[PDB]
Coordinates of N, CA and C in Angstrom, one line a residue:
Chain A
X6 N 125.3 -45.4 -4.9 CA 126.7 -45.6 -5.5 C 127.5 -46.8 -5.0
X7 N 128.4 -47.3 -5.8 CA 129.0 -48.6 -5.7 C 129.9 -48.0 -4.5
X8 N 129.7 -49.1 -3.5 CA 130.8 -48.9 -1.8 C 132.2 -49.2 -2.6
X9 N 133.1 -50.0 -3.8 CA 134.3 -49.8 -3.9 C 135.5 -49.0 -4.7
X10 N 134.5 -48.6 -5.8 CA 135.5 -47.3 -7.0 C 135.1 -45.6 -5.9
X11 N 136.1 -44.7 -6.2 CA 136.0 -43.5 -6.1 C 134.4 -42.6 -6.2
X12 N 134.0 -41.9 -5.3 CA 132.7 -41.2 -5.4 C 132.7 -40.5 -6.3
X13 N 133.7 -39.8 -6.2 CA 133.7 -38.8 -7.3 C 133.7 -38.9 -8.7
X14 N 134.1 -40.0 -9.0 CA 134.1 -40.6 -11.0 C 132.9 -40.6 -10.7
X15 N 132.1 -41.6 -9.9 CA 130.5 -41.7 -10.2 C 129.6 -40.5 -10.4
X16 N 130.1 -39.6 -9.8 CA 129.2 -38.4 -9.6 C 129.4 -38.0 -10.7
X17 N 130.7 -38.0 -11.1 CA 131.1 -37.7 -12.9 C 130.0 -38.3 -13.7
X18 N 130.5 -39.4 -13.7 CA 129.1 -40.2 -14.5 C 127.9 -39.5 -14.4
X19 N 127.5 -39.8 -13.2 CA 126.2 -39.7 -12.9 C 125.8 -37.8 -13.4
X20 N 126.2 -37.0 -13.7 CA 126.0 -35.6 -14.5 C 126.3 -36.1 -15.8
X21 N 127.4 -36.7 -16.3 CA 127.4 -37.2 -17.9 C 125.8 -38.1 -18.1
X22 N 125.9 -38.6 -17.2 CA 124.4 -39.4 -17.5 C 123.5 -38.3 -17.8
X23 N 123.2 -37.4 -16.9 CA 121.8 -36.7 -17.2 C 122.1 -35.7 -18.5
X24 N 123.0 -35.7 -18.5 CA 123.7 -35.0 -19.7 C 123.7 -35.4 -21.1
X25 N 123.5 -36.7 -21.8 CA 123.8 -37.2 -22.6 C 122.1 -37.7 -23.0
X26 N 121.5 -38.2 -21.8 CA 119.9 -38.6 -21.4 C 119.0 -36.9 -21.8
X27 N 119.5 -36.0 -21.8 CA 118.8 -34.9 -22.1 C 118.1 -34.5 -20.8
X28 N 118.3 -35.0 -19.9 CA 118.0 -34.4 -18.9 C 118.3 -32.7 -18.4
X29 N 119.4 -32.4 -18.3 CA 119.8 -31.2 -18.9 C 119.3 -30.8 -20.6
X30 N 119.3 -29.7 -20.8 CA 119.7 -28.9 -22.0 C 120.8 -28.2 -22.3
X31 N 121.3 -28.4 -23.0 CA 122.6 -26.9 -23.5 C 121.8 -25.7 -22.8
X32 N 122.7 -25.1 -21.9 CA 122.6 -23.8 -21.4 C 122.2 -24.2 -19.7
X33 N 121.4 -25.0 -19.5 CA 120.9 -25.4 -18.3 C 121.4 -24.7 -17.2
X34 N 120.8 -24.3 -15.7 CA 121.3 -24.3 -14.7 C 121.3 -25.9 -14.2
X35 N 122.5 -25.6 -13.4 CA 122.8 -27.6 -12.3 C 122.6 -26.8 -11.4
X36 N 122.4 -28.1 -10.5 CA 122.5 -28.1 -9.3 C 123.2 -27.4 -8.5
X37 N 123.4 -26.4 -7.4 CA 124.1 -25.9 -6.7 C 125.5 -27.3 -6.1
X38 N 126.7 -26.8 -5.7 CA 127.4 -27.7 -5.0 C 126.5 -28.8 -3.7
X39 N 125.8 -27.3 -2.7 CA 125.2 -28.1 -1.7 C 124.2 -28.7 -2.3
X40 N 122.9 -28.4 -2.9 CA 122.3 -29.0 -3.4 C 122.1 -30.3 -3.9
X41 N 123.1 -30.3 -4.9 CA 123.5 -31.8 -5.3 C 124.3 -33.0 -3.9
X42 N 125.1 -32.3 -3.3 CA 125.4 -33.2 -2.2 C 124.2 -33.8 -1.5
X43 N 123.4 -32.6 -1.0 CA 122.0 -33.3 -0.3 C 121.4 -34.0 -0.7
X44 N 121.1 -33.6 -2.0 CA 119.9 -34.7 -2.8 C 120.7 -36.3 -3.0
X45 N 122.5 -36.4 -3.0 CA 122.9 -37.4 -3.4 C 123.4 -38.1 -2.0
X46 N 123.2 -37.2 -1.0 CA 123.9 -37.7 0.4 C 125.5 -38.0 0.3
X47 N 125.9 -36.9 0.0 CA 127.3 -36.9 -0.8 C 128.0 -35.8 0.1
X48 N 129.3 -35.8 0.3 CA 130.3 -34.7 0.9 C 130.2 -33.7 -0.1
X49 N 129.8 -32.7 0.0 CA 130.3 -30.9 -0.8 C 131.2 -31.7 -1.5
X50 N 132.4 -31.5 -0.3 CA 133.5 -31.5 -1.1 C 133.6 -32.4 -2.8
X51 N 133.0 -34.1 -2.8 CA 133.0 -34.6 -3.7 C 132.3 -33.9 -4.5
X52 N 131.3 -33.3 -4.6 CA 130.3 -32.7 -5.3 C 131.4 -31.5 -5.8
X53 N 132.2 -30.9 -5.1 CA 132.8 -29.7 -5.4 C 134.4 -30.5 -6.4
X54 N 134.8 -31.7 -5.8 CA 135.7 -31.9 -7.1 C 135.0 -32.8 -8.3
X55 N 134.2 -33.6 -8.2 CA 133.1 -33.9 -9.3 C 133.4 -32.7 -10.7
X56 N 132.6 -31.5 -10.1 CA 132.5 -30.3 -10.4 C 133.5 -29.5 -11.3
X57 N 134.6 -29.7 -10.7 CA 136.2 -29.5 -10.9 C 136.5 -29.7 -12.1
X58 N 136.3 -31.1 -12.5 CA 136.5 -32.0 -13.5 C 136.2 -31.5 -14.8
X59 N 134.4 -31.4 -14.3 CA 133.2 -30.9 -15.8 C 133.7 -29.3 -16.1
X60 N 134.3 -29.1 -15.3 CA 134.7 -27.5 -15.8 C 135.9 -27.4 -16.3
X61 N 136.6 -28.6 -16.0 CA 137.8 -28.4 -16.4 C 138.1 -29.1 -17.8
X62 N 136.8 -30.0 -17.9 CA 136.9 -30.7 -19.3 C 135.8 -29.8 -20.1
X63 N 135.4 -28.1 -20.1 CA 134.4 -27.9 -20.7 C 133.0 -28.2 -20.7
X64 N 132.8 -29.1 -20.2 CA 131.3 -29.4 -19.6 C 130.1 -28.3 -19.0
X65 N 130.8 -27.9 -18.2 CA 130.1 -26.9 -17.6 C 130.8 -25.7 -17.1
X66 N 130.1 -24.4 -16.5 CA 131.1 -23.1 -16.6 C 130.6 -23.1 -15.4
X67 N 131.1 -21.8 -14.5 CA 130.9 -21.6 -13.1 C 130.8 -20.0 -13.5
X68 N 129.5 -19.6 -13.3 CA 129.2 -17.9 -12.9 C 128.7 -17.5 -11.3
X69 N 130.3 -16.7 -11.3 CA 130.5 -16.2 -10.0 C 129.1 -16.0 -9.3
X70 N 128.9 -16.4 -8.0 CA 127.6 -16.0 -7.2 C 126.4 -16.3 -7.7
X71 N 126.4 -16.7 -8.6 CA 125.1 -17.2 -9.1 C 124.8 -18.5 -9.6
X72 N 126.0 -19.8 -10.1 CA 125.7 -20.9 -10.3 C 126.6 -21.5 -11.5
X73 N 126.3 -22.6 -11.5 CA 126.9 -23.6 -12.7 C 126.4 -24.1 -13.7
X74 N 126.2 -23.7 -15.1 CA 125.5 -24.0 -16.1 C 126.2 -25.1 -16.7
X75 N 125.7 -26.0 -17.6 CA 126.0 -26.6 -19.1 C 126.0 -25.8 -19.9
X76 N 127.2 -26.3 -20.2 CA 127.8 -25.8 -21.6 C 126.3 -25.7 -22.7
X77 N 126.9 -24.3 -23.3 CA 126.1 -23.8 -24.3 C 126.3 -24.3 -25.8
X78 N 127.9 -25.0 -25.6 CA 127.9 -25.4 -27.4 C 127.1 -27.1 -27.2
X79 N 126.5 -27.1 -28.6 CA 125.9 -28.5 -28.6 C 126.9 -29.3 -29.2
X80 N 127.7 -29.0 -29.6 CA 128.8 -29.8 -30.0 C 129.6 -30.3 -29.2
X81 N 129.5 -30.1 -27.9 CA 130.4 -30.4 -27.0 C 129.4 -31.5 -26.2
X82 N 128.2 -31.3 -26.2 CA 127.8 -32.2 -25.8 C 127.7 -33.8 -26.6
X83 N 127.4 -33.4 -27.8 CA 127.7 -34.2 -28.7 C 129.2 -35.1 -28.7
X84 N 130.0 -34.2 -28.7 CA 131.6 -35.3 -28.1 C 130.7 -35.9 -26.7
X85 N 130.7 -35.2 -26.1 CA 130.4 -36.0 -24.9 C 130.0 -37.2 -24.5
X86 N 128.7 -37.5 -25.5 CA 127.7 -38.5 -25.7 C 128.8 -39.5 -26.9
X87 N 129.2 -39.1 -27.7 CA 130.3 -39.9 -28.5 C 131.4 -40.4 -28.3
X88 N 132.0 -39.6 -26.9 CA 133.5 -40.4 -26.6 C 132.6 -41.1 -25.7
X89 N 131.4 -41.4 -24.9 CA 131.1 -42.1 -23.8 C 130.9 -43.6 -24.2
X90 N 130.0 -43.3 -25.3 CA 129.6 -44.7 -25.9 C 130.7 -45.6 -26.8
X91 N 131.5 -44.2 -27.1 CA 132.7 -45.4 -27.8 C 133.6 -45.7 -26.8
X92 N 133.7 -45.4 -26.0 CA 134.7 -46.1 -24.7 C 134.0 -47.3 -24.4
X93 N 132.5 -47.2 -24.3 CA 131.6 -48.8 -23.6 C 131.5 -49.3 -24.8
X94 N 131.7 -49.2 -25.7 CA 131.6 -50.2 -27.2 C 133.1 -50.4 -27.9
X95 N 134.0 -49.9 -27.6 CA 135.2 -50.6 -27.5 C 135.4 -51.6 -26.3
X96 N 135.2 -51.5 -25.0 CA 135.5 -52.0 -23.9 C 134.8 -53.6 -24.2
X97 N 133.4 -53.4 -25.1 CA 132.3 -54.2 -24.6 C 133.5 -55.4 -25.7
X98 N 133.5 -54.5 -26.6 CA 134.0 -55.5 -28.3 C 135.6 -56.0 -28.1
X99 N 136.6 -55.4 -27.4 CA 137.1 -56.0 -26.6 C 137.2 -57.5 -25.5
X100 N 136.4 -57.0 -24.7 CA 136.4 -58.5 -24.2 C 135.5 -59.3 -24.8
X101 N 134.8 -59.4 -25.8 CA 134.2 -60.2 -26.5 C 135.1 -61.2 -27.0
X102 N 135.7 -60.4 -28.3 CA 136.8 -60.6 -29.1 C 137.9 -61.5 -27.9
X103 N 138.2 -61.2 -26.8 CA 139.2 -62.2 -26.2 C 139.0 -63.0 -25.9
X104 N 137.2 -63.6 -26.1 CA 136.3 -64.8 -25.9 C 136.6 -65.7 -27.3
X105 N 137.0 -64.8 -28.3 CA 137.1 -65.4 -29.3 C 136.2 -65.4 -30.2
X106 N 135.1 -64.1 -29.8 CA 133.4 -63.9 -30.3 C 133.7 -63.1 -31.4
X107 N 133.5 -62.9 -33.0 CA 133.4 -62.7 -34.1 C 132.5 -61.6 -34.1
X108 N 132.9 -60.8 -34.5 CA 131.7 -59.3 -34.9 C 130.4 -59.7 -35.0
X109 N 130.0 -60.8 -36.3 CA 129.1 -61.1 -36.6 C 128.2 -61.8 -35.1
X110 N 129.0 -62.5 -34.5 CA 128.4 -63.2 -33.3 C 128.1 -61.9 -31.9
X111 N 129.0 -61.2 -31.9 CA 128.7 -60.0 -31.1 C 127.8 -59.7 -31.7
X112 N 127.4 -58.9 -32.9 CA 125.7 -58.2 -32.7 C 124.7 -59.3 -32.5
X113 N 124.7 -60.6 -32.8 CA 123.9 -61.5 -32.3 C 123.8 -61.4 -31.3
X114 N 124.6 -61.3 -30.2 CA 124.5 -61.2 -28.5 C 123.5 -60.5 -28.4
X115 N 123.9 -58.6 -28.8 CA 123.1 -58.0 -28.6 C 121.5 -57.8 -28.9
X116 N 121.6 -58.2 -30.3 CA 120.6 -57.8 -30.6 C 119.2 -59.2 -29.8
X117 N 119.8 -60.5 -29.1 CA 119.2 -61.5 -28.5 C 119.0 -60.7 -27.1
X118 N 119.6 -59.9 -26.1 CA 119.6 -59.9 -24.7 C 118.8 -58.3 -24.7
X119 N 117.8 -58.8 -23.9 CA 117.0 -57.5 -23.6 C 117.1 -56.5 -22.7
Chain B
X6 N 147.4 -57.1 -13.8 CA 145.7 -57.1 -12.9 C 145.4 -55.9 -12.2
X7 N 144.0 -56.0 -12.0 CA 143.3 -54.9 -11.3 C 143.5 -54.9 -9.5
X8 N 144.1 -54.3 -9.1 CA 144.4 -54.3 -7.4 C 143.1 -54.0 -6.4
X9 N 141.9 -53.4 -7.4 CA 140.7 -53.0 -7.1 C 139.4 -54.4 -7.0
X10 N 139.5 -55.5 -7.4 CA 139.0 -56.5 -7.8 C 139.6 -57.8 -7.0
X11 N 138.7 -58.8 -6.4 CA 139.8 -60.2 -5.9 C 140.6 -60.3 -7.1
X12 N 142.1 -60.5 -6.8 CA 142.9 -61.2 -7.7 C 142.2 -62.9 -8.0
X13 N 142.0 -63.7 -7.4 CA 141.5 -65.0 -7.5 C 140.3 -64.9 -8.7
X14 N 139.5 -64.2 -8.6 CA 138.3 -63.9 -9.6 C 138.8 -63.6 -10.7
X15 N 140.2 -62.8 -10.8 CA 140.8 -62.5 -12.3 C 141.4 -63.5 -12.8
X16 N 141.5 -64.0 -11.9 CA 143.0 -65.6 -12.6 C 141.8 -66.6 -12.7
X17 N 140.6 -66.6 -12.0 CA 139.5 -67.5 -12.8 C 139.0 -66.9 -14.6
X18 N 139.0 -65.5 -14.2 CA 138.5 -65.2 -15.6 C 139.5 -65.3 -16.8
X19 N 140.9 -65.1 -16.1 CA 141.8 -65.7 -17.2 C 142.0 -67.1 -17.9
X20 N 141.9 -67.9 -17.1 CA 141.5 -69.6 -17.6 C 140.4 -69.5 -18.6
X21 N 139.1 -69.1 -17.7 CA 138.3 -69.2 -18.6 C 138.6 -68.7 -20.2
X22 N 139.2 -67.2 -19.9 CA 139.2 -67.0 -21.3 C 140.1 -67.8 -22.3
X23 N 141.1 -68.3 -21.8 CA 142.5 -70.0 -22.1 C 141.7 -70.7 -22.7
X24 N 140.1 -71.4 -22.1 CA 139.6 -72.4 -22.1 C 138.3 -72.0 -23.4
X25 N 137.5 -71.0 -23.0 CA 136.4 -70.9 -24.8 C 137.7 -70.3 -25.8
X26 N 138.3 -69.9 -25.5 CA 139.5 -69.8 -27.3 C 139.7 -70.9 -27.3
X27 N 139.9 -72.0 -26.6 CA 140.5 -73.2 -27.1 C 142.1 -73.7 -27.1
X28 N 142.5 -72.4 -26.4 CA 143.8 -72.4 -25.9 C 144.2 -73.3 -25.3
X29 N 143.4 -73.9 -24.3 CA 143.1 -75.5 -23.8 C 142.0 -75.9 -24.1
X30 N 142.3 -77.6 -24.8 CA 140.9 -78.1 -25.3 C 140.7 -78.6 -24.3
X31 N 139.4 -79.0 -24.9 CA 138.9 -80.4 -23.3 C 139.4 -81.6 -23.4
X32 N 139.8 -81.7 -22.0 CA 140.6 -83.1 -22.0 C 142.0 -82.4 -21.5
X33 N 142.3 -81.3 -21.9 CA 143.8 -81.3 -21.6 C 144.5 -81.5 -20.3
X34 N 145.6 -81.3 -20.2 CA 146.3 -81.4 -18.7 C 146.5 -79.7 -18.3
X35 N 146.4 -79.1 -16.8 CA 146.4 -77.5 -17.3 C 148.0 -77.9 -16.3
X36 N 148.4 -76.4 -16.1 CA 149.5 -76.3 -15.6 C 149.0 -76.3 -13.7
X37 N 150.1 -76.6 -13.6 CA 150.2 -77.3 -11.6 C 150.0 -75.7 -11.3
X38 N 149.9 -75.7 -10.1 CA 149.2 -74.3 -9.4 C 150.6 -73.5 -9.4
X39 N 152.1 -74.6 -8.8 CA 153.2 -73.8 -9.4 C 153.7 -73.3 -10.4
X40 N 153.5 -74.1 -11.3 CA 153.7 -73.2 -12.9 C 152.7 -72.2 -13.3
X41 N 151.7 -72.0 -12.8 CA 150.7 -71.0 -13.2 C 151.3 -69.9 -12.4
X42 N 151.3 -69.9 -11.1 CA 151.8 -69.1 -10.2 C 153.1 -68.1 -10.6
X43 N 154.1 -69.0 -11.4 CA 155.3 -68.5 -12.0 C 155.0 -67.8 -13.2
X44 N 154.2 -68.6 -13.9 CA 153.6 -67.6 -15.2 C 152.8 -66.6 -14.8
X45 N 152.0 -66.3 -14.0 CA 151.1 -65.3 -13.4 C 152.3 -64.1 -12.8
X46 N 152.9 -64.9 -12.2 CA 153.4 -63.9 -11.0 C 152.3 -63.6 -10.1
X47 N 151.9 -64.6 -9.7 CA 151.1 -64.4 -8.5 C 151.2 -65.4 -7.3
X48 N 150.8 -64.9 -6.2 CA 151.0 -66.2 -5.1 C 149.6 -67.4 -5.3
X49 N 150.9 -68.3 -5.1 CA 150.2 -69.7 -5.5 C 148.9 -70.1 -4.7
X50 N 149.0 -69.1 -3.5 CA 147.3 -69.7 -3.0 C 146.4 -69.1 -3.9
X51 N 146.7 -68.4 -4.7 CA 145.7 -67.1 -5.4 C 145.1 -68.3 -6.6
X52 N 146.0 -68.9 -6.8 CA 146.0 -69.7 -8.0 C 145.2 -71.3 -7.2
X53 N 145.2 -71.8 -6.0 CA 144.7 -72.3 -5.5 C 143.8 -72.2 -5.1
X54 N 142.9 -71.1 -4.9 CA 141.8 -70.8 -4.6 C 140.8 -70.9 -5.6
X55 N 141.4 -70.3 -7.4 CA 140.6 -70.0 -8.8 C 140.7 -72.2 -9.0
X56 N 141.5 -72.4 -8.9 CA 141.2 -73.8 -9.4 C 140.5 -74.6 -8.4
X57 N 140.5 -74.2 -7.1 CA 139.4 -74.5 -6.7 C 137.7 -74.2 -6.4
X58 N 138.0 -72.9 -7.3 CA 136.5 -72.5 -7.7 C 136.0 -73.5 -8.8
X59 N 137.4 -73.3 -9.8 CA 137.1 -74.2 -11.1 C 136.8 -75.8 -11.2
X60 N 137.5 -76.1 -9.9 CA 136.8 -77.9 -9.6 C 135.4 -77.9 -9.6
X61 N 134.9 -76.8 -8.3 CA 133.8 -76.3 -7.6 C 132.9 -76.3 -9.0
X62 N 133.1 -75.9 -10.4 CA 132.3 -75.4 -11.3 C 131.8 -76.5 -12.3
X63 N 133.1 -77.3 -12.1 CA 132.9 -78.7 -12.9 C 133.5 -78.3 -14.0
X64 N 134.4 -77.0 -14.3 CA 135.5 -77.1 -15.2 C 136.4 -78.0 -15.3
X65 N 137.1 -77.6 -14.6 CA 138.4 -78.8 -14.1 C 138.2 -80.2 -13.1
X66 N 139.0 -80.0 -13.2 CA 138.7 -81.9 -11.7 C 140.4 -82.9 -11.5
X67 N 140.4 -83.2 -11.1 CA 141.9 -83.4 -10.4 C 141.4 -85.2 -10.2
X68 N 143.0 -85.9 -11.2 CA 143.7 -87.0 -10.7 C 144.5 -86.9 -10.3
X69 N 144.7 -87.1 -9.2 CA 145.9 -87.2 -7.6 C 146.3 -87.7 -8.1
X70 N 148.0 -87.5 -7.8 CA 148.7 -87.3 -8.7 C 149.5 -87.4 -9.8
X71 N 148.4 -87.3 -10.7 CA 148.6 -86.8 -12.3 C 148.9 -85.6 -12.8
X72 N 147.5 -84.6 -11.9 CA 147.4 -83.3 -12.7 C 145.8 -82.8 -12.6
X73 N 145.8 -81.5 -13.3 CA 144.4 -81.1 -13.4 C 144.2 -81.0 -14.8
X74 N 142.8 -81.5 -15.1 CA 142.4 -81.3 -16.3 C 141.4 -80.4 -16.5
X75 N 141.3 -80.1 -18.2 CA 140.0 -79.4 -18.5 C 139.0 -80.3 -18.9
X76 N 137.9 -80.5 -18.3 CA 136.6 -80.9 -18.7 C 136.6 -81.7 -19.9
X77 N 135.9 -82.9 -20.6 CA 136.5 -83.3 -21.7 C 134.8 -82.9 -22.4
X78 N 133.7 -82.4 -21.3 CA 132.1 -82.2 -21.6 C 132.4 -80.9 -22.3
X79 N 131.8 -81.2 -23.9 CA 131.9 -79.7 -24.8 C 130.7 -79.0 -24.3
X80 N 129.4 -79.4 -23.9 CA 128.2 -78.6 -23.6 C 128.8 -78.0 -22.6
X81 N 129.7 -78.4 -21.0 CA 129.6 -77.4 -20.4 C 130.5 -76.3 -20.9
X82 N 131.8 -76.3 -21.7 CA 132.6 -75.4 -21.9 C 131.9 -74.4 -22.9
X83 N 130.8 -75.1 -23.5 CA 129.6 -74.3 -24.2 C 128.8 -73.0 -23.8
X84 N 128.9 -73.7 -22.5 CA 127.9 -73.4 -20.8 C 128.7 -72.0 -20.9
X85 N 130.1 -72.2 -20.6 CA 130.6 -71.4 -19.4 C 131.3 -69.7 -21.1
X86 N 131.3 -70.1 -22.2 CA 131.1 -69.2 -23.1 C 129.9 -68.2 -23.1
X87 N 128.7 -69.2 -22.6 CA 127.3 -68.4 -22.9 C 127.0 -67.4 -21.5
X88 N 127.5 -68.1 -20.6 CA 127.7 -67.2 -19.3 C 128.2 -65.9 -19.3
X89 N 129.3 -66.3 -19.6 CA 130.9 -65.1 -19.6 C 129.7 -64.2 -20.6
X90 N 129.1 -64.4 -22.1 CA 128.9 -63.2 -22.9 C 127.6 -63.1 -23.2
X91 N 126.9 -63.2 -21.9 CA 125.8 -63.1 -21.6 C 125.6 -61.9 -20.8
X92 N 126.6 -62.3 -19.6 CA 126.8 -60.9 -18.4 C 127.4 -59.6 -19.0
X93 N 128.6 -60.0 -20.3 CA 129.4 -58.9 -20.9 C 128.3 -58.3 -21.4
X94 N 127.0 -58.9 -22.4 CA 126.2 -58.2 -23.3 C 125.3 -57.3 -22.3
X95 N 124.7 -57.6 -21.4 CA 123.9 -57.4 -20.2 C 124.5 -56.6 -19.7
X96 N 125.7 -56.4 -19.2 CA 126.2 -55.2 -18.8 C 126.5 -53.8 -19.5
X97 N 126.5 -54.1 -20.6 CA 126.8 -53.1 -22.0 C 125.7 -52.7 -22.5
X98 N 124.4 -53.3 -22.9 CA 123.3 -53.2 -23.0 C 122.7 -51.9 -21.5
X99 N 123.0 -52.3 -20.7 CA 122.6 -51.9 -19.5 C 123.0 -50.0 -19.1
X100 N 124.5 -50.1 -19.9 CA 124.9 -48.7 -19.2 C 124.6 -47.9 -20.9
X101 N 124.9 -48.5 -21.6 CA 124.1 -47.8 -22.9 C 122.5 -47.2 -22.5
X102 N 121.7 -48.3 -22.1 CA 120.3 -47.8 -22.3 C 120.3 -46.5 -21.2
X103 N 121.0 -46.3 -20.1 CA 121.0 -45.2 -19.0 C 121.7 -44.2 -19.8
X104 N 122.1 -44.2 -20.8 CA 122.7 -42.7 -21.3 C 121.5 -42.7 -22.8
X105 N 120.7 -43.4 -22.2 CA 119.2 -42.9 -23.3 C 119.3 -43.5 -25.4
X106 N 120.5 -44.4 -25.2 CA 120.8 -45.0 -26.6 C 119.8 -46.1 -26.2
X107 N 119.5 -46.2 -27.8 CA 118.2 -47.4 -28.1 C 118.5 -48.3 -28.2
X108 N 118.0 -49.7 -28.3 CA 118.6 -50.8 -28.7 C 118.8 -50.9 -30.4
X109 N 118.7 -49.7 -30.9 CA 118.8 -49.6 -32.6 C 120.0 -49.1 -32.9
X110 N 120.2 -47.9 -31.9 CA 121.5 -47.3 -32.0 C 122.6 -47.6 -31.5
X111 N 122.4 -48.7 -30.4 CA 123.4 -49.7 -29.8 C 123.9 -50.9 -30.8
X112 N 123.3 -51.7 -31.8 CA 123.8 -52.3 -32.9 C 124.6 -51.3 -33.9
X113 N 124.3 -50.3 -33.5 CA 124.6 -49.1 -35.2 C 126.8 -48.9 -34.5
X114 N 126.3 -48.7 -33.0 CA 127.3 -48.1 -32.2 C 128.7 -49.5 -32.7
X115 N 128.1 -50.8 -32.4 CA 128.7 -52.1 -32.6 C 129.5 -51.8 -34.0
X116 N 128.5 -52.1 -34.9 CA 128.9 -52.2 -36.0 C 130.0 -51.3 -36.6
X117 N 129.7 -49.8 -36.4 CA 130.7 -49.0 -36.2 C 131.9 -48.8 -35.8
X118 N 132.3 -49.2 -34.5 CA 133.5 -49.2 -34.1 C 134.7 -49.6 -34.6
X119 N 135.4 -48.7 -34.3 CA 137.1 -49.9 -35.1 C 137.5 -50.1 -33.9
X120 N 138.5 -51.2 -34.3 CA 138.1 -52.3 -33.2 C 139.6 -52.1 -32.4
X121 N 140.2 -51.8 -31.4 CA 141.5 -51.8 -30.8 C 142.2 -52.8 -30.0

């Protein structure tokens, strides 16, 4: 993880990542709180407000004593994967455009850089 | 600006962006480190430091006392467009492919967007 943004967005990310990658499935068990801290060498605690967040944005549910699943609707993961990539494809088309780079010349970037 | 980021790195990247729009051509005169400073609202070493990255880059270059100019060489101002949206594509490309989008579906995503 990057030493200067907040741990905790990353950790965000980094569950939206496996989440979007299919790494998960709709329904999945995650990681326990400790679990995930170990494997990431991370404080609980960040792992436990990480956590906070995905539950609090519907992402994932918490069943008492027994764990934290992904969300069961597919549609939710579907926004998920759709507001992520339109945030990085506004952002990207954005500072292009303040280069003065033309739509047409933006997919040339892309579709040239491997 | 971003308080997370060197300020000096942002006020380089704002020139540059001044300089491929053509907001300054090549050849121009730019603004003294005090007038930038005033327009920025930033402290003038901040602004001292980016223009002397930008000497450092062979953007700009300084006749004592006249002023600083931009570059009058179109290939490097060429240069420093292909840089800047090389790293932007590269980085966009990069966090796309980690959320498992293809390079088919990353043109589809482009084309798509409305634009803000």
């Amino acid at each position: 993880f990057d030493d200067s943004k907040p741990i905790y967005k990353q950790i965000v990310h980094y569950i939206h990542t496996e989440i979007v990658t299919g790494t998960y499935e709709a329904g999945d068990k995650l990681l326990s709180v400790r679990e995930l801290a170990t494997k990431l060498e991370v404080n609980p605690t960040t792992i436990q407000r990480a956590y906070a967040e995905l539950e609090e944005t519907e992402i994932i549910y918490t069943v008492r004593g027994t764990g934290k699943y992904l969300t069961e609707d597919k549609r939710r993961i579907e926004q998920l994967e759709n507001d992520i990539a339109k945030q990085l494809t506004e952002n990207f088309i954005s500072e292009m455009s303040k280069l003065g780079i033309n739509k047409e010349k933006i997919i040339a970037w892309v579709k040239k850089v491997e």
